[PDB]
Amino acid sequence: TEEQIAEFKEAFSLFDKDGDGTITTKELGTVMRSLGQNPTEAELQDMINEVDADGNGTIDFPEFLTMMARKMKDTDSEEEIREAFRVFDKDGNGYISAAELRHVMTNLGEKLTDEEVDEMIREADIDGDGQVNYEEFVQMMTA
């Protein structure tokens, strides 16, 4: 909406320091450093290719707005996360214990704070069986 468009434009302006409606790798890296994370050249180019549907290496405001328009369900990532968790479903029964889930989330792949995992278990322990399911999990996230 109008508020969404205005806020997106403000975020883009904070992104594209050049002011020419073209978010480049350097500006993305600087804003990332301001946020705290350190993006590498590979990460920056992968991101730009992910967003750049034209191939010039820079993104215009409509492109950013349309990529942001994607919702949780519109991403059609249900299958992707389903198979990923299946990979993490060691037994394959459709459930995983709390301890192993915490270990895999905190200590493998991208390290993430304990507050986030605590929040996820809080918002996901619908039954609180320890061996919490992941199928209905991903269904509810995608919804």
Partner: protein, 327 residues
């Protein structure tokens, strides 16, 4: 005792559905059991052994029906382990599986039992149902598709050799040999000889025929044996590749990144959100790009990354030494 109930349901589902260890013993047992029914039916076809074969086959088939019924019921019950098939709705959707409905038709027809012809057809149908997952068909199709061009080359040239040799021998033996009185008989001979089956019902007798048959067997036999060799080597090479790829198993970190990314994306519900969604995209791309190659391409890419990285470090050291020179 719902905990033990669920544990047993999981164990039974593991056995009946995808097994890994000694559940293969049960699966081989039920196989042998149906195979014994097939063999006893074959013997029942013979008149002399009709009586004893039928006597044993009655009880063996009744046992088969009992075991198939109990197995099907236990399967439909144990499908509850998967959350997809829960309650009546989920379990009925499970019964929608093609092999489940095929198995139901099997029981219905068996209890209902061209009677002998129908029995043979249903025995074949049970045997094909034996797979229940399509693994063998998928593997064979994959290996055939991989070598499609070579198989087509073998087929094409071998078929041309068959046609040419059959026609030439027919020409050389049209009159002097009773076997090759029509081109169809010559083609039958060519197919039966190039496959190396060699029934001996037909074979050239004139010197023309024997000469041409020699020079064309020395080609057609190899061409007809090729596809077997090509597929065998393809299977062995694929096994070796699976053995190698089983080691590095690099699907872990991309999956962890993807699941943490999805969690963050759900938590994210303006620039911070943009970063969240872009990093989610990054995680998804990492996952898929890890899925795709799954081969030595990973090793070569890692080599390239290490190289370019070390070259960048070299540039950094060169800059530092230059700055020291200036200082």
């Amino acid at each position: 005792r719902n905990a033990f109930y669920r544990k047993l349901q999981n164990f039974l589902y593991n056995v009946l559905e995808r097994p890994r260890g000694w559940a293969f013993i049960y699966h081989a047992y039920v196989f042998l059991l149906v195979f014994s029914c097939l063999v006893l039916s074959v013997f029942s076809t013979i008149k002399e052994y009709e009586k004893s074969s039928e006597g044993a086959l009655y009880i063996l088939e009744i046992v088969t029906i009992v075991v198939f019924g109990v197995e099907y019921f236990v399967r439909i019950w144990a499908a509850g382990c998967c959350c997809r098939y829960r309650g009546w709705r989920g379990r009925l959707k499970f019964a929608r599986k093609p092999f489940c409905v095929i198995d139901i038709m099997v029981l219905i027809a068996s209890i209902a039992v061209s009677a002998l012809r129908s029995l043979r057809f249903l025995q074949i149908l049970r045997m094909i149902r034996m797979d229940r997952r399509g693994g063998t068909w998928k593997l064979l199709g994959s290996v055939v598709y991989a070598h499609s061009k070579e198989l087509v080359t073998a087929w094409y040239i071998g078929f041309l050799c068959l046609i040419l040799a059959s026609f030439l021998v027919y020409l050389a033996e049209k009159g002097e040999n009773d076997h090759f009185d029509t081109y169809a008989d010559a083609l039958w001979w060519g197919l039966i000889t190039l496959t190396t089956i060699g029934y001996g019902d037909k074979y050239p007798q004139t010197w023309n025929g024997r000469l041409l048959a020699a020079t064309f067997t020395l080609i057609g036999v190899s061409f007809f044996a090729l596809p077997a060799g090509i597929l065998g080597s393809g299977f062995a090479l694929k096994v070796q590749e699976q053995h190698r790829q089983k080691h590095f198993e690099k699907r872990r970190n991309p999956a962890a990144g993807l699941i943490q990314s999805a969690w963050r994306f759900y938590a994210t519900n303006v620039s911070i959100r943009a970063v969240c969604v872009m990093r989610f995209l990054v995680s998804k791309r990492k996952f898929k790009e890890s899925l795709r190659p799954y081969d030595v391409m990973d090793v070569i890419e890692q080599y390239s990354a290490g190289h370019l990285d070390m070259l960048s470090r070299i540039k950094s050291l060169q800059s530092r030494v230059d700055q020291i020179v200036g200082r």
